[PDB]
Structures are given as structure tokens and as C-alpha cells.
Amino acid sequence: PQITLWQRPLVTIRIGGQLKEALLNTGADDTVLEEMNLPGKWKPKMIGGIGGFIKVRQYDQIPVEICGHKAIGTVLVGPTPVNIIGRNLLTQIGCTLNF
């Protein structure tokens, strides 16, 4: 589809069997989701942004469905105010910026 930027780019995503509201983020390397109890092995990690770093748990090859499209990759989970879908997954659903 085509998404304008007047409003925050919120879309519906399906992960771990649940449907969630995530923000499309060209400015995020990784994908960070609100704390949730996922199955699987996970390594500890530190990621930063404006304001500093926060510790998150890293899960690999997690199947995610973004607005109908299907992708699968790394997902960081932690103390975040919103679900951030980063470039790692955006590339997988053929998403681009145009102006």
C-alpha cells in the first residue's frame, strides 16, 4: 500500500499468535516490541536511542506478519513505550520511501 506521514505510521502486526499495533520506523535498525512473554532462547542486549540505553531480550527468527505480509527475523523485547518495527523486517516486506 501507500502510507502518508501526516499521522504516525501505525499498522497491525501478527506475532506469537497475537495481533499488535506497531510503528513503521525507517530510523530503527532493529525491531523492538513491548515486553511480552515469548517462547524460545534469548540473549541479553543493550540498545540505545535518544535518552540512552535500555536492556532488552533478543529472540531470533520470530515469524511476524505485517499488514498481511509475512516476514521472519530478530525481535528485541523490553521496556519500550511502543512497538517499533525496524529496517530488518521492513526490507523483508519490500517497503521503500519515496519523494
Contact residues: a copy of itself, CB under 8 A: 1-6, 8-9, 23-29, 32, 47-54, 67, 69, 80-81, 84, 87, 90-91, 93-99
The entry of ligand ROC, a copy of itself, none near residue 3 (CB within 5 to 8 angstroms by kind) is a copy of itself
Say how far apart CA 43 and CA 41 lie, in whole Å.
7
Rank residues 11 and 23 by Cβ distance to ligand ROC and give the closer one.
23
Question: C-beta of 35: minimal distance to a copy of itself in Å?
Answer: 13
Say how far apart CA 75 and CA 15 lie, in whole Å.
10
Report the 10 Å Cβ neighbour count for 67. 13
